Amino acid sequence: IPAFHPGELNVYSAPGDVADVSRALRLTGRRVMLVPTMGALHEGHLALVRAAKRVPGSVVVVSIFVNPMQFGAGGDLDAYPRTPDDDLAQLRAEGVEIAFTPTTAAMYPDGLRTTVQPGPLAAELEGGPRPTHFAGVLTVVLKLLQIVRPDRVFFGEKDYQQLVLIRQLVADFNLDVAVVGVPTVREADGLAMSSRNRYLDPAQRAAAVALSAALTAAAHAATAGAQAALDAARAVLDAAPGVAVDYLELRDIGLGPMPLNGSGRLLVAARLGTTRLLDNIAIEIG
Amino acid sequence: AIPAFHPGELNVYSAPGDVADVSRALRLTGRRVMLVPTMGALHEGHLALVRAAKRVPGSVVVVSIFVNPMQAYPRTPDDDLAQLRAEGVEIAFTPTTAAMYPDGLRTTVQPGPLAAELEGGPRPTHFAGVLTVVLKLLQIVRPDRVFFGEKDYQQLVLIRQLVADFNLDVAVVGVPTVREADGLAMSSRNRYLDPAQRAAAVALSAALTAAAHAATAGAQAALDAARAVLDAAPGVAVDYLELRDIGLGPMPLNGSGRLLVAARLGTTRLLDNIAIEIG
Ligand SMILES: CC(C)(C)[C@@H](O)C(=O)NS(=O)(=O)OC[C@H]1O[C@@H](n2cnc3c(N)ncnc32)[C@H](O)[C@@H]1O
Ligand SMILES: CC(C)(C)[C@@H](O)C(=O)NS(=O)(=O)OC[C@H]1O[C@@H](n2cnc3c(N)ncnc32)[C@H](O)[C@@H]1O
Numbered sequence: 226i227p228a229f230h231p232g233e234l235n236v237y238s239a240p241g242d243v244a245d246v247s248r249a250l251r252l253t254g255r256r257v258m259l260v261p262t263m264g265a266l267h268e269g270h271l272a273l274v275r276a277a278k279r280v281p282g283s284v285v286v287v288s289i290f291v292n293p294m295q296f297g298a299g300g301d302l303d304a305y306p307r308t309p310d311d312d313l314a315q316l317r318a319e320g321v322e323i324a325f326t327p328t329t330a331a332m333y334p335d336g337l338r339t340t341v342q343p344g345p346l347a348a349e350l351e352g353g354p355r356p357t358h359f360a361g362v363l364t365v366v367l368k369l370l371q372i373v374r375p376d377r378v379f380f381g382e383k384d385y386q387q388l389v390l391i392r393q394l395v396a397d398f399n400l401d402v403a404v405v406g407v408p409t410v411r412e413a414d415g416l417a418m419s420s421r422n423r424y425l426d427p428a429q430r431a432a433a434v435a436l437s438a439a440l441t442a443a444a445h446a447a448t449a450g451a452q453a454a455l456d457a458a459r460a461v462l463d464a465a466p467g468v469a470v471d472y473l474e475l476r477d478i479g480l481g482p483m484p485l486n487g488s489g490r491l492l493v494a495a496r497l498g499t500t501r502l503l504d505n506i507a508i509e510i511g
Numbered sequence: 512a513i514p515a516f517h518p519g520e521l522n523v524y525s526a527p528g529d530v531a532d533v534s535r536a537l538r539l540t541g542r543r544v545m546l547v548p549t550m551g552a553l554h555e556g557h558l559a560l561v562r563a564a565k566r567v568p569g570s571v572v573v574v575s576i577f578v579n580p581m582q583a584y585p586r587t588p589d590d591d592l593a594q595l596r597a598e599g600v601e602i603a604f605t606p607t608t609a610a611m612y613p614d615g616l617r618t619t620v621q622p623g624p625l626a627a628e629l630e631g632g633p634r635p636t637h638f639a640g641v642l643t644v645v646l647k648l649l650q651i652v653r654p655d656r657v658f659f660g661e662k663d664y665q666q667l668v669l670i671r672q673l674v675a676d677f678n679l680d681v682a683v684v685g686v687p688t689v690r691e692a693d694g695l696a697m698s699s700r701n702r703y704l705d706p707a708q709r710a711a712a713v714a715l716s717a718a719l720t721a722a723a724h725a726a727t728a729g730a731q732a733a734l735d736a737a738r739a740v741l742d743a744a745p746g747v748a749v750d751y752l753e754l755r756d757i758g759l760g761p762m763p764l765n766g767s768g769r770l771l772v773a774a775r776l777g778t779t780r781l782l783d784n785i786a787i788e789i790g
Contacts, residue, residue: 338624340621340676345617368678394618396613396614398650
């Protein structure tokens with residue numbers, strides 16, 4: 226056990242350090258909350274932090290780790306935004322007591338050896354062109370969960386497929402953690418907050434409102450049925466200058482091997498220049 | 512409410528949630544939870560693991576009995592439970608397949624490359640099944656220590672890889688192989704051997720022990736000694752005979768290693784392995 230000062234941000238890099246502190250905290254009755262991130266923190270991440278913080282007796286651990294395993298080769302890893310100074314400043318301002326900032330060597334001392342193989346969902350949507358991406362995500366989240374052993378772990382609805390996959394991980398491996406989904410944080414015009422939004426120039430930023438406009442239009446059109454919802458979204462995306470749609474799909478809420486009934490999720494991915502944006506929304510049919 | 516637990520009696524649980532709750536409750540009361548994963552049909556080899564678990568001060572012993580479809584096998588539940596009662600084991604965990612896999616096979620563990628080697632030759636998905644079910648059992652029971660036999664050495668090493676790679680907070684304890692009077696490693700498969708096969712089967716252990724003593728003369732002497740012993744036996748189809756380092760990487764020039772053999776006698780496949788010190 227190393228030093229933990231309450232009411233202050235404590236930064237630990239060694240997995241053993243945070244594990245020891247987490248264990249000590251949990252044994253004195255504090256409930257440990259985990260918020261996994263890759264840093265470059267914005268208000269969307271802070272929504273998860275605040276959700277963690279309101280759990281009574283909670284101590285909040287925010288992990289910051291840009292996980293190489295979930296990146297495909299081709300510059301994405303090097304290009305991921307890194308603003309560590311701002312990140313830690315934001316955590317202090319939010320009254321977070323623990324930041325976990327491990328090294329790549331500490332997380333992957335043996336390279337890729339034992340890993341998590343996700344179910345068939347990982348091959349679809351985001352995983353279509355990136356068939357190893359979610360194995361990266363599930364592997365690192367499993368490790369983080371084992372290191373920190375939180376009572377609850379927090380994920381954004383922003384990455385809805387990721388959230389679904391984490392619930393599968395938790396169910397399928399009998400993990401003793403509650404997964405808390407947190408609603409998507411949006412800019413004033415509807416644009417879902419993302420560390421990638423910084424790559425939109427003013428014109429592309431203008432056009433990007435089309436993703437959330439399309440989804441919200443769909444959600445209201447859905448009283449008229451699925452075809453109406455999808456065609457409303459398509460019309461909006463089609464009206465938008467320089468938006469190239471990768472996919473627009475309406476699925477059951479579990480995204481799994483079940484047909485759409487009363488409750489669905491509409492998911493979109495689109496490119497604005499080289500920037501790929503995602504958004505999704507709850508859809509109720511009829 | 513925590514499920515009923517009767518100290519000093521064998522308490523049997525089939526629901527994962529029940530064993531999980533009892534385990535958590537017990538650890539809070541100052542017990543150290545010991546897990547011994549098995550597939551039932553228990554013999555003295557399995558009981559050696561039980562006895563290792565039992566001697567830890569403060570122990571409560573959890574023996575799981577579960578035939579993992581992912582990795583007909585003998586099934587004697589009444590008899591198994593009686594053996595555990597006779598050993599003073601307080602918890603048996605006996606889940607159904609549906610309880611262990613309520614959503615079928617979905618998220619699984621993918622082992623590292625060692626899983627494709629040795630036993631993974633004939634059964635390239637076997638260790639994925641093993642690591643998946645062991646990970647689940649570890650998360651359900653959350654033991655302080657988990658016990659595995661040196662009998663399945665490759666399994667044991669792979670479980671150490673699992674634990675290190677996923678940052679699992681459990682100590683893995685390897686338990687020495689229990690052997691019949693002539694050296695044959697104990698296994699439920701031994702009873703399938705006919706008299707001539709059973710007599711020939713002694714060559715696996717004889718070959719390994721000969722090798723371990725021949726090892727003062729170096730690695731090649733150790734291997735040649737083992738091959739000679741196996742070559743003296745009729746009807747023993749050697750699948751592999753390999754000297755590796757203790758983590759089953761390539762054998763160093765000197766130091767500690769493991770010699771592993773597998774062979775087929777008729778339709779029965781037998782395994783054995785032994786510690787080797789080179790020079
Ligand atoms: C292995 C990790 C799970 C750490 C990685 O894959 C990851 O997603 N990293 S992340 O830094 O991009 O996001 C961290 C968490 O913040 C969530 N998040 C992001 N933007 C928003 C938003 N606008 N509103 C609500 N929630 C949001 C996101 O869904 C995720 O759960
Ligand atoms: C997923 C499981 C780990 C439950 C499964 O793969 C398995 O190995 N099941 S098992 O019933 O075949 O073995 C249970 C345990 O007993 C151990 N074992 C068996 N025979 C001996 C022996 N003769 N001497 C010492 N130890 C022995 C074996 O290595 C394993 O750790």
